[PDB]
Design a protein around this nucleic acid. Structure first.
Length: 580
RNA sequence: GGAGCGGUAGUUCAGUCGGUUAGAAUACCUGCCUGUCACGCAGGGGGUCGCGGGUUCGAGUCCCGUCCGUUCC
């Protein structure tokens, strides 16, 4: 009655061995006077074989797919192997077969993948609602398990680097502004509430103030905000905080850590070190701070090439970003790339065709006079199409940049592999909001760069933060910064952000407080584990790497949540559903 | 939010441009088949055509309300 091998791991080496298996019937092939059964468990498919003489035979007939069975048999080498199966050179001669549980037909199949066939794609709304059957699939189990291997290596590694795993609160204090959080009613006192943690941010520093050196926690975060992109009401992060670290210290650890995670779960070997790029460079070269380095169609400023030009647009433009695509684009395509540009904020998207000795199309008239120079900058050959976005340096680049991304599609760029890169040197503050003060780019506890320090007052702009993103394939998978451990500095930083003692207390009260008892220099980084897994996995959604995610509206089909409650169960909490 | 788009066997869908017995494929079921591995062959069952009302000699098809899914902004 006890299995003796995972059905899917039997091998030539087991030939001759009496065996007992337990699993799911993948498919049956009843040749009549012979019956073959593809027995399955998390480790693979073995083929069971039944002969009329054996007591297994009778049961082997009525058995059906997704039926749970316990099979006792004898591993024998197959006359003619199944080259697509790991256990394909062998099979079991059922001494017995017993139904542990019958099963009705699945709303969708769950077997091709176990044979190595391109699993089909049941509608997401079907997989969600039967998630337990969806997880019988091979890709899901494979992801769910890549996940395990991944996290387990994060422990393995950080533990080895003396990081203390500390589990942080789940029930906290709703914060005044910013990220809307999920609230938990306090029964014992209507109107009072707990808050589901946006992240361990504060407790991780406290733990640093606490004398622990380096903490790490595969945290769980919540945020009641549009699951717009592939968001989930609540996700998972790798949260890591360190003391007596300078940015370099934090990056080098994460690099090496990442390295480990990959070599350990994907058996990939990311070359090191990851490359770095100032926000200034990422923005320029790609018009984005999460560069997709899988291919290079870099932007180029050419703003200067037109200061003598009569083409009003290019000359009276703060910036003119130039991107040349290796392809004469259709009017259709060019029109599409244009909506991208406008969708990011851009008055429009000039273009022109590069033919020998000149340009034709779009804006070629004015490119002509600067031809030679413009060719050297964009490295464009004849047959290429030049695309231009002109306007504010940022609008210019984020737009030409978006375009650059669609263009990778349009062009066909088979974007493969993994490209990691640190985006360092972001500015401490940023700006646009008709409410004219300086907004803190990242977090208010984000430490300015020691150099730029005298700049806080005289030039809030050129002040770089000691923050950094970790991006993979144009995806922000990590954020983080060195933090302010000196109350006075934090104080000076609050001055720029037009922040008073009022909001200061009411938002960071206990923490600025703690800063008074000897906070060490610290800072760390958080990894949005979900997206990191989607990417290592190839899933287009983080849902493929979450045992039971929610649908786009954050509703849970499988379970029927959210849901209503008894009128009195809510009353016990002292609240009332008000609207009408 | 805006529109489109879709809803018809268990699944995927077709039902042509209003009158074809609402069918295919696949799935399921039964029969036969002793080396199959997508076994094969034969046959069988399975339809609230999203719901409501409307247009019409005739509605799965068109109108409208409304519900649900889904895609680009």
């Amino acid at each position: 009655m006890r299995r003796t091998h995972y059905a899917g791991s039997l091998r030539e080496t087991h030939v001759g061995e009496e065996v007992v298996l337990e699993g799911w019937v993948n498919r049956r092939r009843d040749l009549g006077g012979l019956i073959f059964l593809d027995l399955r468990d998390r480790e693979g498919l073995v083929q069971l074989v039944a002969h009329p003489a054996s007591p297994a035979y009778a049961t082997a007939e009525r058995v059906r797919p997704e039926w749970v069975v316990r099979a006792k048999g004898l591993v024998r080498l197959r006359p003619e192997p199944n080259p697509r199966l790991a256990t394909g050179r062998v099979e079991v001669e059922l001494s017995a077969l017993e139904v542990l549980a019958e099963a009705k037909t699945p709303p969708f199949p769950v077997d091709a993948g176990w044979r190595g066939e391109e699993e089909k794609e049941a509608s997401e709304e079907l997989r969600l609602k039967y998630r337990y059957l969806d997880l019988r699939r091979r890709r899901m189990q494979e992801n769910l398990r890549l996940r395990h291997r991944v996290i387990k290596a994060i422990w393995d590694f950080l533990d080895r680097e003396g990081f203390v795993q500390v589990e942080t609160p789940f029930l906290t204090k709703s914060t005044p502004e910013g990220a809307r959080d999920f609230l938990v009613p306090y029964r014992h006192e209507p109107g009072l509430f707990y808050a589901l943690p946006q992240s361990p941010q504060l407790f991780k520093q406290m733990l640093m103030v606490a004398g622990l050196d380096r903490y790490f926690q595969i945290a769980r975060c919540f945020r009641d905000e549009d699951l717009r992109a592939d968001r989930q009401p609540d996700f998972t992060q790798l949260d890591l905080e360190m003391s007596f670290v300078e940015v370099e210290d934090v990056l080098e650890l994460n690099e090496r850590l990442m390295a480990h995670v990959f070599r350990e779960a994907l058996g990939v070997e990311l070359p090191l070190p990851f490359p770095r790029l100032s926000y200034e460079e990422a923005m320029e070269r790609y018009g984005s701070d999460k560069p997709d380095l899988r291919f290079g169609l870099e932007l180029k400023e050419v703003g200067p090439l037109f200061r003598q030009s009569g083409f009003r647009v290019f000359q009276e433009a703060e910036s003119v970003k130039a991107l040349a695509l290796p392809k004469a684009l259709s009017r259709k395509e060019v029109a599409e790339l244009e909506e991208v540009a406008k969708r990011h904020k851009a008055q429009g998207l000039a273009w022109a065709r590069v033919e020998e000795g000149g340009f034709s199309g779009g804006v070629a008239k004015f490119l002509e006079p600067v031809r030679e120079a413009l060719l050297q900058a964009t490295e464009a050959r004849p047959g290429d199409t030049l695309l231009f976005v002109a306007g504010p340096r940022k609008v210019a680049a984020t737009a030409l940049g978006a375009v650059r991304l669609r263009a990778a599609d349009l062009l066909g760029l088979k974007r493969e592999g993994f490209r990691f890169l640190w985006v360092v040197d972001f500015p401490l503050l940023e700006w646009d909001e008709e409410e004219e003060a300086w907004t803190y780019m990242h977090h208010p506890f984000t430490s300015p760069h020691p150099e730029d320090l005298p700049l806080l007052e005289k030039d809030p702009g050129r002040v770089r933060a000691l923050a950094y993103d970790l991006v993979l394939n144009g995806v922000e998978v990590g954020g983080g910064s060195i933090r302010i451990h000196d109350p006075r500095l934090q104080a000076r930083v609050f001055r720029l952000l037009g922040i008073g003692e009022e909001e200061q207390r009411e938002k960071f009260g206990f923490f600025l407080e703690a800063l008074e008892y000897g906070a060490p220099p610290h800072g760390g980084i958080a990894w949005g584990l979900d997206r990191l897994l989607a990417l290592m996995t190839g899933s287009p959604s983080i849902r493929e790497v979450i045992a039971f995610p929610k649908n786009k509206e954050g509703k849970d089909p499988l379970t029927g949540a959210p849901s209503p409650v008894p009128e009195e169960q809510l009353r016990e909490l002292g609240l009332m559903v008000v609207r009408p």
